[PDB]
Structure formats: C-alpha cells, structure tokens
Amino acid sequence: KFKLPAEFITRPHPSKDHGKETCTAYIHPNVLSSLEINPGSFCTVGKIGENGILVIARAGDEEVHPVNVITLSTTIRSVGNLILGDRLELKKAQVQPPYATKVTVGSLQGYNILECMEEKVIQKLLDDSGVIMPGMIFQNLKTKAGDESIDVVITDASDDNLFYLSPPFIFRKGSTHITFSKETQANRKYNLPEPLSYAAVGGLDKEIESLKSAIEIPLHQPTLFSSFGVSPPRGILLHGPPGTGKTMLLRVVANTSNAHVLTINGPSIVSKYLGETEAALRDIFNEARKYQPSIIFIDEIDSIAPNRANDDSGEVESRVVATLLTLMDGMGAAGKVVVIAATNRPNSVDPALRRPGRFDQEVEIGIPDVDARFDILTKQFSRMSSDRHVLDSEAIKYIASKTHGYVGADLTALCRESVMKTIQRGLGTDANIDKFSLKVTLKDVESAMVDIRPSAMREIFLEMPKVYWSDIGGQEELKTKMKEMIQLPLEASETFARLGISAPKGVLLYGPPGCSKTLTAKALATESGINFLAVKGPEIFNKYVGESERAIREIFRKARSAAPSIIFFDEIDALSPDRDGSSTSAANHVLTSLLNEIDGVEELKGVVIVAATNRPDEIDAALLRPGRLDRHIYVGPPDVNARLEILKKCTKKFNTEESGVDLHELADRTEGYSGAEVVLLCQEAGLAAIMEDLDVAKVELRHFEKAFKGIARGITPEMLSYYEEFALRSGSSS
Amino acid sequence: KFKLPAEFITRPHPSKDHGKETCTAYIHPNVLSSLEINPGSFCTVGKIGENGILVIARAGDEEVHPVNVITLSTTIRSVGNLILGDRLELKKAQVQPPYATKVTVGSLQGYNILECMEEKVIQKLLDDSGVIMPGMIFQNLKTKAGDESIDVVITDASDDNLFYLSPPFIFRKGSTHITFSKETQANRKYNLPEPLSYAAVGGLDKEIESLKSAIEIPLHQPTLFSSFGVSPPRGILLHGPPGTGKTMLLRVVANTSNAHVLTINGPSIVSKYLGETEAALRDIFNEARKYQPSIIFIDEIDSIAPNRANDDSGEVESRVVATLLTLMDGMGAAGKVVVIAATNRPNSVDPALRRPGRFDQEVEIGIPDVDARFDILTKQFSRMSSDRHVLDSEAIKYIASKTHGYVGADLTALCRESVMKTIQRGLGTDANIDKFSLKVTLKDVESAMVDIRPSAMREIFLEMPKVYWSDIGGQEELKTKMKEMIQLPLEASETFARLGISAPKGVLLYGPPGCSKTLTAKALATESGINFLAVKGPEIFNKYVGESERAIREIFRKARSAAPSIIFFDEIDALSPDRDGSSTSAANHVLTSLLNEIDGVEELKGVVIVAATNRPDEIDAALLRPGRLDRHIYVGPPDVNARLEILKKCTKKFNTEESGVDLHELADRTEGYSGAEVVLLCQEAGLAAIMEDLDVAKVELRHFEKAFKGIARGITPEMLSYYEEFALRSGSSS
Ligand SMILES: Nc1ncnc2c1ncn2[C@@H]1O[C@H](COP(=O)(O)OP(=O)(O)OP(O)(O)=S)[C@@H](O)[C@H]1O
Ligand SMILES: Nc1ncnc2c1ncn2[C@@H]1O[C@H](COP(=O)(O)OP(=O)(O)OP(O)(O)=S)[C@@H](O)[C@H]1O
Ligand SMILES: Nc1ncnc2c1ncn2[C@@H]1O[C@H](COP(=O)(O)OP(=O)(O)OP(O)(O)=S)[C@@H](O)[C@H]1O
C-alpha cells in the first residue's frame, strides 16, 4: 500500500516559464492517482495552515521526479511567496474559477508598459497562462529592443474565495481589458504575502555586503576552493544586539536566493528518546545535499548548542552538538550548501561549533547610529508612504536624533503605535471617521512613542542638547582661546600627515566646578561641525572585566574610526588621581590603557582628547606633560554679561521681566555664582514660587533675594588662590 | 515481549579470512524478526547520524550472540571506518542494488597487481563478496608464491530511494570489468571517511612509540608479563599545553588498534540524577571487560575526576572519582583493558588516580621544537596537491624557524589561513580567475602568519609600532652588543655549543631619561623574530599579600612556554626595593620572586632578560650579579653624529635642505640634549610651521630658532656625573 506524504517539497521547474506551463505545476503521477486528481485539473497548493493557491495538475516523469517533490514554474511560486523548501498541503479543488473580464497589470519599477513592450507578447503570456490570480510574475520577458528585462506582475482581475489565498480568473481573449498600471504590488485588499527583499533591510549595507560574500563563496563556487584540499568557509555566524535585523537578514537571504532553503528549527526538530534528534539532523543535511544549492538556517543556534559548561546543557545539547560536528565537518568539497547561524550573543555557543571549518566566519550586526536610523525610518515608512503624505524627510532626522537606544525593531514598533494613535486620532476627531481620509501626523507620532519603553540602553550616543557658540555665556576670551587652539589642529590634518608630524593631543580646561565646563563641549557636540563623544567621569573607570582596560580601547576605536573627534574626559583629575603617595586609588588599569592607547601605533588622524578637571593638581603626571595632553587652558565662571545671559538661560517658562523684575536687572546682581549656581539661585526662586501661590504665578524680587541668602558666595578666593598657585606652574616652565 | 535495542555494538567476525561471509552482518534472530529483516535480505548498518552501509543479514547463534552486537568484516568496516564498539543503527532496505559494469581496484602498497597476483584471485574475491562498494579494503592478500602480502582497495565502482555512504553494486563474473589502478585510496568523489594514521602526527616520535608499547603489550601480548610475574600497565595519561595534539593521538590510537574502543567524553556521561554518572562509568568498564582487548578513552579527565580535596569538589566529584578508582584497581579485576586519558591540567586530576596501578605512565606532550615544527609543517603541506610552490624543505624550514612558540593547532590554522589569503588574493585579481592554479606563494604564508597568534601568546597584547634598528640614531655599541645577545646565539648555535659556552642571558640598559632605552627594547622585539614579553615597574604592585610575586611567576611561566623570548623589565628600580632603608618601599617580596625566577633551583633555559632603569644604583647587588643581569650597558645621551641622524630621519618630509636649513648647525647646537628632545625639537618646529598656515609651509630656520628658546635641557650635569660614576664601580674594571 503506497503511502501519500503529508507534506510535499517545493522545487524548481526546469521547464521555461514563458510557455503555457504557468500554473501547470508538474506533479508526480503516483500522487495524482493516489489523490483522485485528474491530469490538467486544478488543485490547491499552500503552506501548512495557510489559505490555498490554485495550480493545474500535470503528470511528470516517474523516474526523474521523486515522490515528495512538486515542481512549480517560477511564475506561481511568487504568487503566494513560495520559497524553495516550503512544505505544501496538496488538496483536491471542487470549483472551477470563472473567466475574466478586466485585468489591471503592474510592473516592477513603474516603467511605462505601453512604451516598452508590445501588447501582443503580453497577451500571449497571459492567455497561455490560462488561470490568473493576482500575484504572479512573468519573468525574463524580451522587450522590443531585446536588451531589457521587464517583469509582468498582475495587480488585480475583476469579473463583471474561501480557502483560496486569492481567487483567480481564467483569462480569456476577446474582452479582457488589460489596463496597465504603475503599481508595484498586487491588489492590497487580499494582501498576498509580500517578499522580504533586500530593499527592506536598510541600514546594514556594509554588513549585508559581507553576508552576501560569505554566502556566495561557499554556496555557488565551492569547487574551486576545494581544489586546495581544505574545507570551504561553510559556517557563517551572525551576532550582535538582540533587536537588530538578525532573523530578518536570514529571511531576506532565504527569499532572494534561488537556493533550496531548509530550516533547523529549535524545538520542533526534536521528538523524544534516542534516534530522533540525530535522525532529524542527518535527514535534513542529506536532503540539503540532494537538492542543491541549499541554505541551512539555524536561527538562535544558542538554544540548541550552549557551551556544555552551564547547568542548562543536558543530554539533548550533547546530541545536537555531536551530530552537527559529525555532519558539518564531513560534507564538503562538492556540495553547494551553506550553513548560516544567528544568535542574540555568540559567546555562550559550544566552541566545538566555533573552530575553523565549523562556524568560523563572522558578520557583526551593530547598533544603528544616528545617521544609520535614516534609512531604517524611510524604508520602513515606505509601505504606506503614499498615505503618509506627511514626511518631507525632515522629521525623520529629528526622530533619528531623539531615538538613542532604538534598535530598528523598536522603530518598527514605533511605526505600529503611531498608526494606532492615528486611528485613535481619527476616532477622537469624529466617532464615525473615515481612516483612509487621514494622513498620519508627527504630533500623534509623538503621542505614540511617549508610551513605549525605548530599548536596552544608550552606548555611544548621549542627549547632546543643542548648545551654540552664539549663546555660550560671554567669555569671549575663553571663546577665542578654545577656537584658536582646538579648531586649528582639527583643521590641519592632511598637512600634518604630509610633512610628517604628530598633531597636538588635547586640552585640559582648567576651572572651578559648576562652570560652563562641559556645557561648552555640548556646543562642541552641536555646532563644532565635528562629531563628539564623552564619558562623564568614572563610568568606565570602575573595576569590571570589560572596563579595566577594554572599554577605553573600544571608545577610542569608535572615535578614531569616525571623522575627527573631540573625545571628552570629564574630571580626569578625579578619574585617575596622582597615585604617587597622595590619593592612591586601586585601579592601576585604566591609566595603563590610556597610556598604551594614546601613545602607540594607532593612526588617530582625526582625534583630539579634550578633558576637564576642577582639582588639576590631582591629575597623574603622565597626562600633564606633552605626549598625552599638550594644550592647557583655564575656564572661569561667567562674567557680568555672561551672567546676564546665563540668567536669561535659566528661565525657560517664566515671565519675571514684564511681570516682576527684569532679567537684565539681575545681570550684575549675581556675584560669586557659577554657571551651575546661578541655576541654583533661579531654581530656589522657582521652588519658592510654588510656595506662595502654589498653582500659577510669576516670581518676586524677594525670591531672588532669598536665593542670594540661602546660597552664599560660591566663587570664593580660595579657588582663586589654588588656581593661581597651580597656574604659575602650568603657565610657566616651572 | 522482546525489546529491540535502540543502538547496536559493532564487533568482528570470528573468521578472519575472505569468503561469502565477508559482506554478511550476523544479527540476533529476534532482532531479525522484529525489524522483519528476513535472513538473507539486505539491511543497512551505519553509525548514528551518518549514512548506512549495505550489508546482507545472517543470523547469529541465539544463545552465544549478544542482542546488541552486529558482527562486521574488516572489509565492510573499512568503508565507513567503523571502529569496534561504534554504535550502529539497523534499518530494512526494500531494495535490490544495481549491477556493475566497470569496477576499479587498487592497492594501498601501490604495487602492480598483474605482477603480484593472478586476476582469477581478484575475480574469485569479488564473486564471493556478493556486493561491491567503493572504499572496501581486502587486507593481507598473499603475493606470488607467498612473497609477501598486499592490501587491495576498491577505489571506484560504476554502472554504465534510501541513502548510502557508498554505492552498492553486485559482481557478475565476466560482465563487470576488473580494471586495475594505482590510486592507493578510494575515489575522492565519494567523501568516504579516510582513516587517520600515525603518518599524520608530527613530532612526538618517542611519545608515539611509548604509546605503541603501552598499548600493544597490555592488549596484544599479556602472557609475556604473566610469564615474567608482573602485572600489565593499565593506564596512560597525556599532559601538556593545549593545541599540542593530544586528541589527535587518541583518535589515531582508536583508529589504528584492533580493540573495543570506548569513550568517556568528559561531560557526555554526566547526569543530574544521584547515581547515574557512576552507573555510566560502571557500564563502560564492564563492556570493556566483556569484549577484549579494550581501550577506554577519557579526554579531559580533569573534567570528571577533579582533585577531590579542593573546595569546589563536593560529594558528586568524590563519588565519580571513587568509581574510577575502584573500576581501575579494586576488588574487581581488569582484564586485557588499557585506559588512555588526556588532560591540560595534570595536577587537577585526583592525586590518588595517578599512582602506579591506575595512570602508571604520564606521557608528556609538550610544545614542538624547531625540528618538530618543521615535521608538522611538512606533513601538513603534504596533504595538498602540487599547488604548494614552497620548496619541500627550504621554504617550509624558513616558516618553521620563523614560528616561535607555536603548538600545532595554530600551525594548522596558519596553513588554512594561507589558503584563505591565496584565494582572497585570487578574488582581488579577478572574480573569474582559474583559482586552482593560484599557487600559495611564501608571501601568502607571510600574509597569513601576521594574522595568527601563537598559542602561548594570545593574551600578550602589544601596540608595538614595528621599530627597526635604523630608527635608533647611533648607539652602535648597544646595537652590536644586543646583536650578540639576541640574534647570534641562534644564528651561530653550533659554534657556542662546540665551545661549551652559553651566551650571556641578561643585560641592564641604564641612562638618562629620553635616551634609546625603551626604543631599543621595541627594536629587539620587532627585529629579533623571537617572542617578546613586556613588563612595567608599578603595574605588578597589587596590594594583596601575594599577588605581585604571582605576576612575576606568571610572566616567567609564559616566557618559558614561548621561549625563545625576551622579557623587558622597564623601570626595574620599582621591582627592586631593598626595604632596609634603600628604597624603603612597602613590605613586598617582588625582588625575591624575580631573583629566583631569573636564577633559582630551576634554570630558565632559553629566555633572555632585558631591564631598563634610570637609577642604576637603586638596584640590588643580587640582581646585578652575573647570571641575572650579566652585561651593563650605558645608553647615554646621543652625541653630535647621532643627533644628525635623528634630524635626518624625522625631517625627511620637510624640505629642509631645499630651504637651506643646514642640519649640521642644528646637530652641533643641540649639545647634551636628550634624543627625545631632538625629536621634540623637530616636531615643535613642525607645529610652528603649520601654525602660520593651514597649507604646507616648509619649515624655516627661524621657527627652529623659536623652538630652541623653550626646550630646556632635561639632562643636568649632575645626572651625567652620576651615571658615569655608576659606569665605573660596576660594568667596569674598577
Ligand atoms: N535595518 C534594520 N535593523 C533592525 N531592524 C530592522 C531593520 N529594518 C527593518 N527592521 C525590523 O526589525 C524588526 C525586528 O527585527 P528582527 O531581526 O526580527 O529581530 P531579531 O533579529 O529576531 O532579534 P533577536 O532577538 O536577536 S533573534 C523586523 O520586524 C524588521 O521589520
Ligand atoms: N601534528 C599535529 N600536532 C598537533 N595538532 C595537530 C597536528 N596535525 C594537525 N593538528 C590539528 O591540531 C588539533 C589537535 O587536536 P586538539 O584536540 O586540538 O589538541 P588538544 O587540544 O591537545 O586536545 P583537546 O584539548 O582534548 S580538544 C586538531 O585540530 C588537528 O587537526
Ligand atoms: N638615539 C635615540 N636616542 C634617544 N631617543 C631617541 C633616539 N632615537 C629615537 N629616539 C626617540 O626619543 C624618544 C625616547 O623614548 P624612549 O626610548 O622611551 O626613551 P626612554 O629612555 O626609554 O624613556 P623612559 O623609559 O620613560 S626613562 C622616543 O620618541 C624615540 O622614538
């Protein structure tokens, strides 16, 4: 008794697609007999659990075709997004689709179908197709010039449903109005599965290029590699943050290639007892060997190959890893098969799968930067941009600037929640709203992301508030010094590379606490015209595996790898103290990392290391001397006019001037109050404001008078003396 | 009711000769019945997780044949390289394999079969064989008149749904041509497993023969010891750094020796249920006793048999070690059983497990010598085709001498990376180039070696901007003496050896700050070729009771493992406080650990120490003693002719001579300057020049004139008199 397989395997149809064989997917005649299916008859082909698609049953050769294999012309696989290795469910159809009266025909790129190709050849393809559902493609179509490939998609067909993903219509010549259209997708109401192509993967062009090379080299041309007697780089591994296009990159690799896509599912490949896990792995790799070229995907390989050094690993992990070691290192030198693995983090995968010959090639998928978010946002925003009509591309930069932490996944969730808030905006404006009349808006998008948890954390990007050289409080002497000395060496970069001389290394920005110290570095991050970076004091300084001597190296590597940078070292004096008999901290590592990084082989073409301090006498002597820091200047608390404009800056939502006391009046009233202490006076006044009216009021002069009492003179002569004592040393050769 | 085994134990036939029993697998009657494998019918037997071998089933004697065992001939086992004790599946094949048309036969020995044997012999062998598959070896066939015996191999088989490891074919006398060949292995098309052999192991010759002796006598000649009234040595332990080839030895021992082969793959036996790990060990040793002779392998013994006295070893480790101890020497007997184990940490193995009677022998497997590395490289490169282009001896000998501290895994990685480099160069030439002819040229090996790191050196991070002797201005005396120390003793080894003289193995470079002290160490590092470990003064002054001495000892351990190597102790004055009043530092014992490591009860052969101090008399007389720091070199300030060379080096990208800037005047007027101050002079003149312009202003003598006005002489006459005084009491006749 012949046994009918439950699931059939999609595979190419060596016959051409231009013929009458569009929906005549050849089926093994034994299956045709065993399922009461007549030749040239319609039957439903579809993935498990999905709505069916219509194919015409045609008998194939018994010997050539194995029983399971079902061959589809490449026109119908694109209907239901049938990629190779997709298990099917053959069933017998019962209703013959009616003929067609109108068909709207699309194109890939919007090319004028009238101008490029004849109507006769298009009609020939369509008629010979016989039955047309919305969603196929007619490929490799020769044009009038003979050198252009334009593909005929079909947007819709109308005649003047259940368990069918789309209802076809039997295209017949004579009255079918073939009205060509610029739409690049099938009819939207049915929503036939959209391919996840390369143009939906934005933000990882370099990484996708590396992945493409790693897939092509073992997949298409392993023979010429194998002549050398050492196995190809079959094993590729993807790792990085657990939100950045990992499974999506695997899915696009599945879609684009024409290589038989197998899949090593994590949980479902394993049944029970013995000889089931190894049986599954053997069978799947053997099938990937029979049908070539093939890709073997292992998404989240960690869930089945932990280190065996953790209590998680049991018998099953030992089975999976042993079988994979036996297989992946055994096959080769002729098989056109690649194994691609991805993981949230790779470091917990058994090394036996990581040695060369096993997964040894790597693709690093990294956090998207501020400039990286633009492509993600715009391409994500494409699916309905015709109904956005709001972008104009400028809000996208703002979003990218304010989404430090989002990993692309959260950006897509932001799109989802924005669409929700647009639906609810339509409902709130009018209960019986028409959503299609709505264009999404940035205000409701803001009302949207104000209710999502952003991401894991922010690593190389900070708030970086907008500060300008046009607003920094007075101190035109400070301004002129910092310009002359930190922008000139950042201008002369090639002229140092030629003439062979290293560039000045950095400035230390002497000054008492609470000044514009780093708030000027905020302008460096806003209006310098040069990208910025910082570590706000002893974050990296702490004693951890990746902080003792590693995080400094990573920070410098990111900064140097970028365009010129003004890397910042807030309170370097407190970070690494003198440690020469006075204030001996226990780190001993971070200063060594800085010493080995700043002075060494690295290029550091576009890099200047700025730092900040309020107790400069505590800096390690290895920094003051030229070689690590060789520029040195002093920042003072704001002068009377700088204090005028800092007083202006403190207020952001108060009307003291017109109602109360002029801000201009306060300019000289504030003496001994540092840039972060005039803030203290203003904030004490603001807290006192909510004590008199308690709901809504201006402030009083006496509020600022109480600010004067409650906060004594901040900038006292002690710091003047301590500085000038240190400055007679720093300023002079002593 | 009868329960068929889930996995089956391989075993040999009692009959060693060739007949109609050859391709027959003797399976138990009940198992035959339960899979319905009717006697005489075809069945497939193959390791779990691999493709099967077709074998024709017979019955075993139901009372003396164990249920688990299938017995297979050496001919069949040669196909899949099935070692005795391998766990086989057994599955019915409802098939009749195809007839043969042309069968190819070869011989391991490569001798002409027409000359050695009569074709009727081969015809009879094949006819009786019943089945033909590529990969079969018919061993011990006698030559003409019994001259010798030859092994004959079925290299290929051709005929003009199950899946098999080798194609099954049938021999039908006369109608299938027995075509001879000289290929000593089966056709490479088939991916047949290829036996690993001792010829693939490099070096370790004496260790290999020790393994041969301790494997052969206990298993294959015990009555010799029973005759001599002594017990057999039932234990071998292999210890040595990782990557030296310990598992390779175990696999070759498994595949070469004719014995029941069992493996405890450390964590593979472990279970979370109370007594199951111990029960796995008992079953393994009882199986070894049952089928004799038997070899039991334990790779990483330390993973399952820890010290049993240390803190983390609780009751579970105690019970597992007790099981191992009692199964090796207890109230039970051993039999013809030998246990072979491997470990990277011999002292972490339980001390009572290494006593004679258990692991009697400890065959050390250490890092390779230059001869050993040459052997490994020749055997690795013998695996390739005639695309090597590395002269079998010369180029490989250069690569072997240039590899210092390599262990053997890294050498295989180097060969694979060389293949990678050659083929990426091929891709960079053109994508469609005929790669196979892209011989790996020695420069490809060089490009590969710069991208690999010796096993003993992954953790030795260095920035090391590739300093060369010519960078050091002058100092010809120091250069000559450092050539004496580092280079010559290896480039003239036989001369020193024949004179009975070991070259001095310590030097102290002392002199004012900013001379060529550290730069000469870096020049040695990046010109001597040998490894180079670096240390600094206060980086190894942890504040715990014994953590600094541990740093010293770890450094010297790595230096020994990576010898030839330099250890450069910059700021050796930090490591040498007397603490009696001279350098009254903390109560640390770093000096003593350094003293004992340099010259103690252990010898420290092969390492050379270079120490640099700018305060030479603050060093202990014991450390300056010959045998610790033999030669004391005074690296003083550069004289005029060295200054001129410095200026020529750094100013070459200036157009000084085209501008009339006479370097003679600069050299003469920079008298008594520190050489670092000469470099500073030129770099500061460059700053001055490129401060007037953002474009390239060629330096001018007046910018140098400005420079001279600021750079103070860092070397006072006091320092010079001090160092010249130390250069009289020590390292001088006085
Ligand atoms: N360039 C991009 N970077 C990141 N995500 C993107 C990008 N482009 C689109 N996305 C969307 O990101 C969403 C989530 O990405 P996924 O790859 O599915 O997450 P993941 O890679 O599975 O993460 P894990 O937990 O490490 S497996 C998808 O629905 C994509 O539509
Ligand atoms: N002559 C050789 N000596 C050493 N290794 C060799 C040699 N020839 C090849 N190799 C390779 O080097 C490795 C030797 O096996 P390894 O298991 O890595 O050594 P081992 O680390 O001492 O054993 P372990 O730690 O129990 S896995 C393998 O990857 C071999 O392919
Ligand atoms: N012949 C030379 N004499 C002195 N310095 C030289 C010479 N040639 C080059 N230099 C440069 O001068 C500087 C001297 O640096 P080092 O070699 O570290 O001197 P050093 O005496 O080891 O300093 P220490 O160890 O901190 S006391 C480096 O920038 C060298 O590149």
From Swiss-Prot, chains A, B:
Quote the annotated effect of C515T.
Answer: In drg1-11; severe loss of ATPase activity. Severe loss of oligomerization. Resistant to diazaborine-mediated growth inhibition
Question: Which Pfam families does the protein's record reference?
Answer: AAA, AAA_lid_3
InterPro entries, alphabetized: AAA+_ATPase, AAA_ATPase_domain, AAA_lid_3, ATPase_AAA_core, ATPase_AAA_CS, P-loop_NTPase
Fetch the PROSITE patterns from UniProt.
Answer: AAA
GO terms, molecular function: ATP binding; ATP hydrolysis activity
Q: What is the effect of changing S516G?
A: Increases ATPase activity. Loss of oligomerization
Question: What controls its activity?
Answer: The hexamer is activated by RLP24 during pre-60S ribosomal particle maturation; RLP24 activates ATPase activity of both ATP-binding regions and increases cooperativity between AFG2 subunits. The second ATP-binding region is inhibited by diazaborine; the inhibition requires prior ATP binding specifically to the second ATP-binding region.
Q: Impact of mutating E300Q?
A: Reduces basal and RLP24-dependent ATPase activity. Increases interaction with RLP24. Slightly reduces RLP24 release. Does not affect composition of pre-60S ribosomal particles or growth
Record-linked SUPFAM superfamilies = P-loop containing nucleoside triphosphate hydrolases (SSF52540)
| Binding sites annotated in the UniProt record for ATP 1 | G240, P241, P242, G243, T244, G245, K246, T247
**Keywords assigned by UniProt, alphabetized:** ATP-binding, Chaperone, Cytoplasm, Hydrolase, Nucleotide-binding, Repeat, Ribosome biogenesis
**Swiss-Prot/TrEMBL catalytic activity:** ATP + H2O = ADP + phosphate + H(+)
Question: Which GO cellular component does the record give, naming just one?
Answer: preribosome, large subunit precursor
Q: Which GO terms describe its biological process?
A: protein hexamerization; response to xenobiotic stimulus; ribosomal large subunit biogenesis
* Localisation per UniProt entry: Cytoplasm
Q: Does the keyword 4Fe-4S apply?
A: no
Impact of changing A523V on the protein?
A: In drg1-3; resistant to diazaborine-mediated growth inhibition
Question: What function does the entry list?
Answer: ATP-dependent chaperone which uses the energy provided by ATP hydrolysis to generate mechanical force to disassemble protein complexes. Plays an essential role in the cytoplasmic maturation steps of pre-60S ribosomal particles by promoting the release of shuttling protein RLP24 from the pre-ribosomal particles. This step facilitates the subsequent release of other shuttling proteins such as NOG1 and allows the transition of the pre-ribosomal particles to later maturation forms that bind REI1. Essential for viability.
Domain notes per entry: The first ATP-binding region binds ATP with low affinity whereas the second ATP-binding region binds ATP with high affinity. ATP hydrolysis mediated by the second ATP binding region releases RLP24 from pre-60S ribosomal particles whereas the ATP hydrolysis mediated by the first ATP binding region is subsequently required for RLP24 dissociation from AFG2, probably by disassembling AFG2 into monomers.
What name has this protein been given in UniProt? ATPase family gene 2 protein
- Where does this protein come from, organism-wise? Saccharomyces cerevisiae (strain ATCC 204508 / S288c)
Origin organism lineage: Eukaryota, Fungi, Dikarya, Ascomycota, Saccharomycotina
